[PDB]
Amino acid sequence: AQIGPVTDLHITNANISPDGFSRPAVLAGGTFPGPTIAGNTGDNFQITVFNDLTDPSMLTDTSIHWHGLFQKGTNWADGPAFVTQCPIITGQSFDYNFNVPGQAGTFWYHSHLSTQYCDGLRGPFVVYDPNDPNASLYDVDDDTTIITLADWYHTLAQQEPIGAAITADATLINGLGRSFTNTTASPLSVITVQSGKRYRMRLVSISCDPNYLFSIDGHDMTIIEVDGVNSQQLTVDQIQIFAAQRYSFVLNANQPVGNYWIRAQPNSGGQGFDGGINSAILRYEGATVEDPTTTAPTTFSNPLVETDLHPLADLGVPGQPFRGGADDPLVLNLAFANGRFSIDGVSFVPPTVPVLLQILSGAQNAQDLLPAGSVISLPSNSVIEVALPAGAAGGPHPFHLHGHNFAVVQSANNATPNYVNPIWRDTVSIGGTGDNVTIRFTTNNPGPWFLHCHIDWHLEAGFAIVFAEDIPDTASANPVPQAWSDLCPAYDQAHNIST
Ligand SMILES: *[C@@H]1O[C@H](CO)[C@@H](O[C@@H]2O[C@H](CO)[C@@H](O)[C@H](O)[C@H]2NC(C)=O)[C@H](O)[C@H]1NC(C)=O
Ligand SMILES: *[C@@H]1O[C@H](CO)[C@@H](O[C@@H]2O[C@H](CO)[C@@H](O)[C@H](O)[C@H]2NC(C)=O)[C@H](O)[C@H]1NC(C)=O
Ligand SMILES: [Cu+2]
Ligand SMILES: [Cu+2]
Ligand SMILES: [Cu+2]
Ligand SMILES: [Cu+2]
Numbered sequence: 174a175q176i177g178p179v180t181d182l183h184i185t186n187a188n189i190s191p192d193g194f195s196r197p198a199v200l201a202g203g204t205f206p207g208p209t210i211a212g213n214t215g216d217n218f219q220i221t222v223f224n225d226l227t228d229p230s231m232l233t234d235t236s237i238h239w240h241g242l243f244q245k246g247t248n249w250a251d252g253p254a255f256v257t258q259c260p261i262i263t264g265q266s267f268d269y270n271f272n273v274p275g276q277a278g279t280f281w282y283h284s285h286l287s288t289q290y291c292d293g294l295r296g297p298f299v300v301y302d303p304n305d306p307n308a309s310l311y312d313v314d315d316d317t318t319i320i321t322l323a324d325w326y327h328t329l330a331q332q333e334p335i336g337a338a339i340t341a342d343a344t345l346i347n348g349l350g351r352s353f354t355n356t357t358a359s360p361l362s363v364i365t366v367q368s369g370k371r372y373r374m375r376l377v378s379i380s381c382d383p384n385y386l387f388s389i390d391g392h393d394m395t396i397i398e399v400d401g402v403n404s405q406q407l408t409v410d411q412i413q414i415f416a417a418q419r420y421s422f423v424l425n426a427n428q429p430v431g432n433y434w435i436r437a438q439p440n441s442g443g444q445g446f447d448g449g450i451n452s453a454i455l456r457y458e459g460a461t462v463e464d465p466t467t468t469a470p471t472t473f474s475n476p477l478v479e480t481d482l483h484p485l486a487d488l489g490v491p492g493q494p495f496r497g498g499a500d501d502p503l504v505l506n507l508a509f510a511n512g513r514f515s516i517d518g519v520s521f522v523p524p525t526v527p528v529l530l531q532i533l534s535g536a537q538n539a540q541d542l543l544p545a546g547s548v549i550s551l552p553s554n555s556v557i558e559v560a561l562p563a564g565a566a567g568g569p570h571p572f573h574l575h576g577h578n579f580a581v582v583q584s585a586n587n588a589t590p591n592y593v594n595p596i597w598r599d600t601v602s603i604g605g606t607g608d609n610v611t612i613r614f615t616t617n618n619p620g621p622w623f624l625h626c627h628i629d630w631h632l633e634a635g636f637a638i639v640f641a642e643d644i645p646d647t648a649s650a651n652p653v654p655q656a657w658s659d660l661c662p663a664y665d666q667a668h669n670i671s672t
């Protein structure tokens with residue numbers, strides 16, 4: 174069952190064996206992935222998070238981010254540790270109480286402390302639309318049509334060297350899959366469909382690092398949503414999905430009753446499908462209970478290309494139709510050396526006092542804010558352009574902005590910008606050497622918003638900056654509850670920190 178929009182959520186330690194290998198984890202709701210949190214557009218969510226963690230090897234503090242939800246007027250509920258809150262300590266709870274006006278789509282939730290989400294705290298978050306403009310394109314849309322793609326590690330995250338090329342041990346589809354080495358025939362996930370029906374498949378990357386080449390043998394996929402943004406229909410036979418992205422696609426169950434492989438090939442880790450790695454099963458009702466015998470093509474003839482996507486609504490692009498044609502045009506210098514990433518010459522290291530609390534305490538320019546050099550102010554009610562030229566080691570890097578979605582004016586692997594009708598989204602691959610992926614948005618949401626690579630190992634190694642959007646209006650726009658004001662005193666007392 175789905176939970177929410179008003180619910181408790183307990184965060185616990187437990188042993189799990191999703192690929193046949195047992196290890197301890199950090200779990201929401203006792204499962205990997207965690208339960209789906211759901212509601213309708215405009216609902217009030219109140220997710221009371223109970224931190225019941227006791228194993229220090231995965232950290233006993235926690236904080237949860239609601240990925241892709243704008244948090245307008247509720248910046249304090251966004252979740253990134255040391256940007257919008259101090260962590261919740263063990264034995265305590267915290268009500269993330271916010272609203273979702275003007276958003277409907279496929280999202281997710283995850284720990285936003287260190288690399289803790291890699292240790293298991295990740296799950297889907299769906300905001301349904303009772304008047305969805307795409308409703309007539311499918312018959313079924315429910316918890317059974319969510320498809321999660323996850324990397325899974327046998328080594329615990331706090332034992333992964335910082336800045337290293339860290340590689341997974343299994344791909345998990347809906348929480349199950351097989352290990353790349355010492356492979357055992359452990360159970361594969363089954364997605365069941367009825368011949369003749371059409372399904373809204375909600376594809377969620379909960380990855381900490383790899384991108385996946387996702388396909389379904391014998392089937393094609395008609396994209397209708399990108400990171401929460403309704404799209405024109407685009408039919409493809411393969412989707413390359415980067416960490417933290419989401420797509421909805423229509424699956425037409427129009428092939429002969431049978432069993433078909435679902436494939437998710439990561440860019441690192443095990444290559445291919447030997448022993449049923451990187452795989453799950455699409456089973457039609459009435460098919461024999463047996464593994465598929467289907468083949469992938471040698472090449473995919475209609476792969477997703479990001480410039481082919483266009484919004485369903487007339488969203489346009491803010492600003493003027495040329496590079497630098499914005500009120501505040503920025504170009505970030507994105508670099509890596511010696512195990513650490515940097516943005517504009519500064520490697521991100523979380524501050525002792527969360528950025529939001531520094532601003533509420535009266536620091537009101539970005540040079541007054543800590544970490545020094547890691548906070549850029551943005552002016553209010555202005556068009557912002559951010560160019561993100563690639564080249565830093567460890568690519569392709571999927572950059573994500575909190576508090577906002579954005580027009581993708583230039584995409585990976587294509588030098589031509591689009592100032593007319595590009596897709597809007599919240600996480601974007603910045604591509605390869607010589608690319609100049611560029612995003613635009615307007616500043617109508619006061620508060621400190623994280624911008625970072627969503628490869629969690631890279632964030633840990635410093636690949637982040639904070640956009641302090643409309644510092645002067647942050648306090649009036651974001652009144653804070655007492656329980657939020659209590660978090661930093663409690664955290665600092667528990668950890669013997671003076672501030
Ligand atoms: C990516 O595009 C940005 C503009 O959006 C380019 O920025 C210019 O960079 C040159 C120096 O390289 C400066 O003289 C200009 O002031 C910048 N802004 C402009 C022209 O609007 C950036 O060079 C591009 N990067 C790559 C690798 O193509
Ligand atoms: C590279 O990106 C550009 C810009 O998004 C794409 O150009 C558009 O192509 C569409 C489809 O043919 C035309 O309707 C638009 O007028 C083009 N816009 C511009 C500004 O040129 C282009 O198709 C992409 N290249 C590839 C190989 O997909
Ligand atoms: Cu996220
Ligand atoms: Cu986010
Ligand atoms: Cu990265
Ligand atoms: Cu983040």
Ligand code: NA
Nearest residue numbers: 489490491492
């Ligand atoms: Na415009």
